[PDB]
Write a protein that binds this ligand. Structure first.
Ligand code: HEM
Ligand code: HEM
Ligand code: HEM
Lengths: 679, 323, 682
């Protein structure tokens, strides 16, 4: 049980009498009044203590990544990695360390939709026996900017316009694309966000990245450059934009519910932790500077070496106390790891510690149960708001004769202390500049675009076409085109069509045809279809419901989550047509006999909106899902102009339909149904 | 200009050089580094002051009605109402008073959709020459509960489940309908929220209500029981649920954009302020108790008397500082 | 161990390596720099996490009673008091309840002197098994004002002037006496503060009062009006003002060190909890309204009935986490107690809850270890800044089918819930007025002054003379005289002398000669001299030291704390003359042979200021302390002009001096050394 240490702070209210926050049993359903129909008395201490706590329930949301969700788990190391790092949690084969991970979007506030197009956070805390170690990462290996002093500029430009606070959780407005084109370093992460990484199917179907180059340090001080990677054991999967838009309204909690259900049903998701290891003398050997967070290291130059696996198998008990209150920091570093001179990483170390003072209104946020380490805290810090401990050592200073030298200093040689990499040097003038090695903003965006499948490339262009069409300012649109043309003339030409602007002349300075592995989503089938959802469209009339039940029973044998849909909640029905939508499912199958609700009077009922069964099947097909119909239900496919000839469409007997749908779920999205420019 | 008093705190940065918050011109696009590819210096005061302010931008959202939008305007009285109230802002015909109004949902957090099904807030401030007077009302004339000590129970049950924080901005979960059926007083507002009032076309197409019976008092102390009413001059209009759902995803800012667009285009919305006036000795004479906020007074028993009109004609300059 | 429950949050750093606040061993004595003589790096996470916690150590001081100190202890009930209250902690003989008590002044800020003249706080928390019960009291039985809405006005006027923040922890300025004379209800507490109650010898030598009339309620709902009393087992004792002033500079921690020393040495102080009980139908039967907080009930009308005793025997381990962070509330009420319509108490209930939001900045301050009850918290409260628990019940609302009705309602008949006194009613118009029964502002101030000894009365008049002479506005001083004249014409006349104002004519509307017991300090000797301090003046020359240590050993047998003073820290010396002052002792005895440092060569030394040994003996005598000299040390008494057989002066051999000094410590202050108005006449 990963949450084991949290047991001593859990409060059970079962069978208990109601109390105030200072003890004493009470009733609190009536205000104390002066007479039968009289005013409430100020001396009603019960009312005021109950309502004061309600009035003060909220804390400020995270300044970025406000919308998110998390879970507990365990990390297991695959070996003794002391030859590359002194980190204790990586220091023995099969060694286990509790973790908590929080996934998120970036721009939207609390309560914005999960399926907005955005970069996604992927923050992992290791509760190691030598302190808390956080990998505060994203699902995209590169970031928008090269210097941390520019973060407020990027965030202000993406977040809503400060006059009317429009739009929510979206980059599709003038200020964001004014910034992207004025700060060309942002074009790389932009392309990733316009790809499937911007609209992932679920938290469980994302890779993770530390982005920054860090250092792993051995006991003697020898260091290697390192990139952190999380490889999902569930496979990467993404939606299409027109689907994520509807899903944002039909279920804003799509991703957090997906993670909760997977853990509750015993289908805990897993990620393997992997690293790219680079010698210090190769920091600028691969066509870019590894101190530059706008570039990633192609796996051809350095393969992914997996060190262990992380599995998230415990949901939180109280969302606010655990998920909302947890405070990640890249400064949460342990012996065996060190920073690099990444100018973006450097400023993060200040911002995360400082921002906790705003979110928690005090300096003792590390004493909260979700932030406490398991390894023990011994220093001379005292007081502060909400001080929860009582310190025994009255000689709270060092050096000191009276405290006998305790707590004692720890360094590289005594006490397993943290230490900066011994060989790191400073040389040159104090400057407010960036290295000229950071100047290429176009090569790797082109490299990323080259490494996607044709339809995958079309998704990227259709995302840019959608977003840039929201820009009202003509010159900003031209600025965007001019910057896109430096990455690829064909991309700029194809985007220019939607904008009604002229196809610009090629600027080939950064054009190239190189490709790299591991960045595409749609070029690989899923390794498992467990937890994937199948919507079964049925009806309470006839014998459709009994066949749907048998269909459901066989689908569930393969680990699928099956929802039978009918007009009302008859026996065996999981959801009404009124509450159903294709966005909730990964496959849509029509049960035999249910074709009666796709035309005629069966399609016109007060129990659901007109055309809802046909809308669900139409949505599921046009969004690239596997769609099916059993037996006579092929009339439902015919009613929407779909033939069994097509890939991802299945008809016939029940067994043939189950096999076809289960194979189609590995493909997940059938890209044959999406038109490409000039096809 | 309704916002005329706010101009003295407005800051124009056009044609100016970047500064810190304590003055002095600066550049803030490069951190100070010790060497060409070196670490950032703690002495970079420029970086830390700019990033500290960013790190501390957020304040707690409202515990309820966190999602909303507002605008400035003018309230104009239709008469000298001194025979029913001593309130200065109603003391003369054509008397004008600046206002600010915020419309909102209730359950959803800051970034939730405008077209979620919910009770809607309708909060009005009159900046009168005898103090600020607020009518903090809703677009529905009755409330769920009869005693304020039960408010945390209602809100907890409607807001997301505390284990996973699901669902956002929705009453369609177990805990809400547990409370509705366990506290039957909630059924009246429930029915209003399940009607078109729960999914209005826009803020401009809602009526407003103070819900509570208040008192109007004259200079010598004669009192009347009063219900506040806002009557939209744009007409009441609502969506249908299957449409509001898609709109929640296609444009979560549908209502705040609608209000902003109407004001910017010169189509300022208006509401008439109307009242029902009841004698003190008839507080229990209309088939219910007028101290009960789960009941409204049918207009057949007491028709509306209109006191004036309010027009919202100025959008805010900074949403955070104002709205 | 009253602190037993706090052991689970105690952190022991001995034998450990330094860590950050998120774990991991570190060194934190050098900043990370870019080069040997280079700038500090932003990536020094160790420096910033250490200095951030330092930068944010302070929390707002209490808006009033900012200066004070406290301790843990145990309260023991003397019987089963279910016949008068359903309160659990009073429900059985020898039933024990942990307590924390904080004593304080009122006006001064965090670092002000203990021995300023002020009302003194006396706040007790009972950690009962049915919730925390707080008696937030003072060492004076009446308060300045009659309605809580006037509290900001009283406090603003007593606290420093808002333009320069002068004076600290003092009522001797214009605005304070402008308010006392403009709001005549303040005159009763004024007189108490101008007496010995304003300058007590220690926290342990104070009585305590809940001030307000409260209600005791039995299981069946029967109620009685009640006044809370704390009666010190150490006896009441006070200083003189000219002594308190010097002590304010010589040791600003005099009272908190006294309490700490007494507990550390095994001399835990004790108070008895006593009540006055009044029938509901007699609330206005004793010459005043018992809802009026400016009045106390004379013990002749209702005697004190002891219910138990409280003993404070454990010092805090961390002052901040315990004493500074503890949050008292009169709203901390339990089953068996109820409020009254005392308009001062009524507003307190709102203010103490609200003010914690400023001091603790978050609604979860009751989760702090020192504020937590021992009885268990079960409700549907959630979230809030700094939420320290993880609630299991996901159906956090009532009523509810899903949570099976739990946590469940508790009332008078079910679950031993709190219930308001069932017989209380409201009747009349909603009003912003005060009951005319509150109108008398002068009778009881006169009763209090009538009940002090003659020299005790002179201390009150001399305190007023000192304070009012600081008032610069002429009219305010005249306004003060007119108000004083309504209490006592002779008081106004003796005060008028110091102010150079004419003796006002009698205004006998409220004059009377009644007296009452239990309000005087100097008319009763102390029941014990334990912990009382003796300063033995000695010297390092000759054999004075060896005799001074024999004197110390005998004195210590009787429970006294003895300080042997000499020119330097020789063997057997506790304190140097440079570090010594008479304010730190209750008696001063010159050891035989030490007369050499009172005159001539031995009195002129670079090791202490000029005349220091003579000044200690002079201060000790002039401030009314028992003073003594052994054998040849009688020369020291003669050098300052003190006759060897005055009252409280003891000369002779060692055994005689010990005998006389211990007897004089019971008298404590020798009042015939203070001139009374009319003594200097011819
Ligand atoms: C490679 C670059 C970055 C990555 C991978 C990243 C990732 C993240 C993630 C995942 C979170 C959410 C943590 C959670 O779930 O609670 C977060 C929050 C945050 N980030 Fe970043 N971010 C980056 C750049 C920056 C920069 C440059 C700054 C400022 C200089 C910054 C400031 C913040 C702040 C203040 C928070 C709020 C944390 C809190 O309130 O607990 N980030 N970031
Ligand atoms: C007739 C019943 C009620 C109406 C019409 C109503 C209406 C409103 C409205 C419109 C707002 C948002 C104002 C804005 O736009 O900023 C609001 C906020 C709020 N309401 Fe209510 N509400 C009602 C019941 C209650 C009750 C019973 C309580 C508590 C006892 C309560 C506590 C609050 C609080 C704490 C806020 C937050 C305001 C802020 O943070 O500034 N409400 N209410
Ligand atoms: C009989 C009248 C009063 C008595 C006996 C009394 C006593 C006390 C005491 C002993 C304390 C300090 C508690 C501690 O040691 O921490 C205190 C604090 C305080 N008092 Fe009073 N007081 C009285 C009148 C009032 C009134 C009328 C108000 C306001 C309407 C008030 C407001 C406060 C506040 C705000 C604090 C700060 C508490 C905190 O910050 O924790 N007091 N009082």
């Amino acid at each position: 049980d990963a949450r084991q240490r949290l047991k001593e702070v859990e409060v059970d209210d079962n069978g208990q009498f109601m109390t105030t926050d200072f003890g004493g049993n009470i009733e609190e359903q009536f205000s104390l009044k002066a007479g039968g129909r009289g005013s409430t008395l100020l001396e009603d201490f019960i009312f005021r203590q109950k309502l004061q706590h309600f009035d003060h329930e909220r804390i400020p949301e995270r300044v970025v990544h406000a919308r998110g969700a998390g879970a507990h788990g365990i990390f297991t190391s695959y070996g003794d990695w002391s030859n590359i790092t002194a980190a204790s949690f990586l220091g023995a084969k099969d060694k286990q360390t509790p973790v908590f991970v929080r996934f998120s979007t970036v721009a939207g506030s609390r309560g914005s939709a999960d399926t907005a197009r955005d970069v996604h956070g992927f923050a992992t805390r290791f509760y190691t026996d030598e302190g808390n170690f956080d990998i505060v990462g994203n699902n995209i290996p590169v970031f928008f900017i090269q210097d941390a002093i520019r973060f407020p500029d990027l965030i202000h430009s993406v977040k809503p316009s400060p006059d009317n606070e429009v739009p929510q959780a979206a980059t599709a407005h003038d200020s964001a694309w004014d910034f992207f084109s004025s700060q060309p370093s942002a074009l790389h992460t932009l392309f990733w966000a316009m790809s499937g990484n911007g609209i992932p199917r679920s938290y469980r179907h994302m890779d993770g990245f530390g982005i920054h180059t860090f250092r792993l340090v051995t006991e003697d001080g020898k260091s290697k450059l390192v990139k952190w990677h999380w490889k999902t054991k569930q496979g990467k999967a993404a939606l299409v934009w027109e689907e994520a838009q509807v899903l944002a309204g039909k279920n804003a909690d799509f991703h957090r519910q997906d993670l909760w259900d997977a853990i509750e049903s015993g289908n805990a998701p897993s990620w393997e932790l992997a690293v790219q290891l680079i010698d210090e003398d190769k920091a600028q050997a691969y066509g870019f500077d590894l101190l530059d967070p706008t570039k990633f290291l192609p796996e051809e130059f350095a393969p992914l070496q997996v060190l262990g696996e992380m599995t998230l198998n415990r949901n939180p008990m109280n969302y606010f106390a655990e998920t909302e209150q947890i405070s990640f920091q890249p400064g949460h570093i342990v012996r065996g790891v060190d920073f690099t001179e990444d100018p973006l990483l450097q400023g993060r170390l200040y911002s995360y510690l400082d921002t906790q003072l705003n979110r928690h209104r005090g300096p003792n946020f590390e004493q909260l149960p979700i932030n406490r380490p398991v390894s023990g805290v011994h220093n001379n810090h005292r007081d502060g708001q909400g001080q929860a401990w009582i310190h025994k050592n009255i000689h709270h200073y060092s050096p000191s004769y009276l405290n006998k030298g305790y707590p004692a200093q720890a360094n590289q040689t005594v006490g397993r202390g943290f230490f900066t990499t011994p060989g790191r040097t400073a040389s040159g003038v104090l400057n407010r500049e960036l290295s000229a090695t950071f100047d290429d903003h176009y090569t790797q965006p082109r490299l990323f675009f080259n490494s996607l499948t044709p339809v995958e490339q079309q998704f990227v262009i259709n995302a840019i076409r959608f977003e840039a069409s929201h820009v009202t300012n003509e010159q900003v649109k031209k600025n965007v085109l001019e910057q896109l043309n430096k990455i690829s003339n064909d991309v700029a030409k194809r985007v220019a069509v939607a904008l009604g602007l002229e196809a610009p002349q090629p600027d080939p300075t950064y054009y190239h045809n190189n490709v790299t592995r591991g960045v595409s989503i749609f070029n690989e089938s899923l390794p498992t279809i467990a937890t994937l959802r199948v919507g079964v469209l049925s009806t309470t009339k006839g014998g459709s419901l009994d066949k749907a039940k048998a269909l459901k029973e066989q689908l569930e044998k393969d680990g699928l989550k099956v929802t039978v849909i009918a007009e009302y909640l008859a026996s065996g029905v999981d959801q009404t047509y009124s509450a159903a939508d294709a966005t909730a499912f990964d496959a849509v199958v029509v049960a035999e006999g249910a074709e009666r609700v796709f035309s005629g009077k069966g399609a016109m009922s007060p129990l659901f909106p007109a055309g809802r069964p046909s809308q669900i099947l139409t949505d599921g097909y046009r969004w690239g899902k596997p769609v099916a119909a059993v037996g006579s239900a092929k009339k439902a496919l015919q009613s929407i102009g779909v033939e069994e000839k097509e890939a991802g469409v299945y008809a016939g007997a029940q067994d043939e339909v189950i096999k076809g749908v289960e194979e189609g779920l590995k493909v997940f999205k059938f890209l044959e149904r999406f038109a490409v420019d000039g096809d």
